Amino acid sequence: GSYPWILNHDHSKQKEISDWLTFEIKDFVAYISPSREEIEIRNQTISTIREAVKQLWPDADLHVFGSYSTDLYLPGSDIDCVVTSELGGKESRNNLYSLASHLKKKNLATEVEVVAKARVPIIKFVEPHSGIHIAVSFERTNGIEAAKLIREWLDDTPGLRELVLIVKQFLHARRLNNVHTGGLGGFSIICLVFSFLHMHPRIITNEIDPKDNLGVLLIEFFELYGKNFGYDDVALGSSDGYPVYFPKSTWSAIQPIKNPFSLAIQDPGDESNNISRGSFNIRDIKKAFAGAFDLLTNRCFELHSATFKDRLGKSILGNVIKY
């Protein structure tokens, strides 16, 4: 119910509510962004865990990949690590059981859970001293070509990180961000935002600067993907680092489509399948974006028509995201 990111950052006196919003987005993002101390601790614990892995396999190393090596992670989310000795393949599991047994014994984990992120077996736990959440696997879970797209998209796309964090937070407050239960995966979310940004009338024309317009773009993102996107008929891909729509009917690789209504995004490492196939709860996802649009827009009307005294210390984002 509190909106800590608002404290000492009131924009209630702003003329354009869509600026109010833009500024609040930046406040939240900075609030969810790490401190030097936070970083110090993270490195220590990671190193502590690496050191515990060396004990089983002195040849192995440990690297952070994913949300945490970009900065697209929500606080408290698992930080993903790969272990590097030739320990993967079919020996993957047997070796995870050993790492688990060992973590528990050395007190770097309490409850350890085995799970799977797309045929890649993963071990989730909490390092007790720091309370940090870790997920370990012997193989990166976000493809290879996909990962590279991410870093590149982040270079040539102002606003990408900010909108992704907001959308990520939104989806998470509702439990709409896990594939296990048919939510949107990480790459998929990044894709949607990226596409939207890169083919927005005011953006391809270089008329607008997203970083100065993330309020509207946020709303319009939920508007596009909540109210208008032809989920049944339109797919997403990339021809030459350029976001692209193509009709399902032309994607022959999958055209015996058992289920018409579902998100279709071209797998960067295999143009043969969509990585969004697993998001079976896409119906409720669309309902939720529309909800977000409704909430944001309604809120904007509500404030743009109230006394400045009633605006003091108010939050636009607060009720849409939860947190």
Place this chain on the structure above:
Amino acid sequence: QCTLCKSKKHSKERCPSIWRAYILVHTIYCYNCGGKGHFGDDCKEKRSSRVPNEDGSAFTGSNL
């Protein structure tokens, strides 16, 4: 019915121009049919979203 928008699908107290404001300094794709050359908003086919929008989106050729 709005006097800012000139439209008659909502009141002034609900005109999208309230929140849809921009601060100013290849090919196009339609969200309705995966077709190129036009925006999904002003497209010719039956709409792929059973959800209405008698008032436009960001994605019309009006470049807004």
